[PDB]
UniProtKB/Swiss-Prot annotation:
The modification Phosphoserine is found at S55. Expressed in numerous tissues, including brain, heart, skeletal muscle and kidney and, at lower levels, liver and placenta. This is Activator of 90 kDa heat shock protein ATPase homolog 1. Belongs to the AHA1 family.
Length: 132
């Protein structure tokens, strides 16, 4: 499978604590994705979101600092996971979120970029009021 790497940076009007909670709380994920979610906020823990269209496993969780996960869309080749790292940086009580994704199927680059920008970043900002 040819793959690609993407890097996204987004600033939120909330603290790293609050943003990290949004990414790692099943009921908050349910709210911003508008769908039932299951999320085990543990190293080794599984997640399943948007009618099972997104799934994966957390491989490193450092509260308020970083999340590393194996992550896929349901349509990707079976057993194919991207590795996504989210880093939470405090900038004056606001949060700079750096997302780095590796191992994204190359045909899926724009779907995955737009999915992250619209369904994570815009979704979180609009649900919780974390700025434009």
């Amino acid at each position: 499978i040819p793959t690609c790497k993407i890097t996204l940076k987004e600033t939120f009007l909330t603290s790293p604590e609050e943003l990290y909670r949004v990414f790692t709380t099943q009921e908050l994920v349910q709210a911003f994705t508008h769908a039932p979610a299951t999320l085990e906020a543990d190293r080794g823990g599984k997640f399943h979101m948007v009618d099972g269209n997104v799934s994966g496993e957390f491989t490193d969780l450092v509260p308020e600092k970083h999340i590393v996960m194996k992550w896929r869309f349901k349509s990707w080749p079976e057993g194919h996971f991207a590795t996504i790292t989210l880093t939470f940086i405090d900038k004056n009580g606001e949060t700079e979120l750096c997302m780095e994704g590796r191992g994204i199927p190359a045909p899926e680059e724009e779907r995955t970029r737009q999915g992250w920008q619209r369904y994570y970043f815009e979704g979180i900002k609009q649900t919780f009021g974390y700025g434009a």
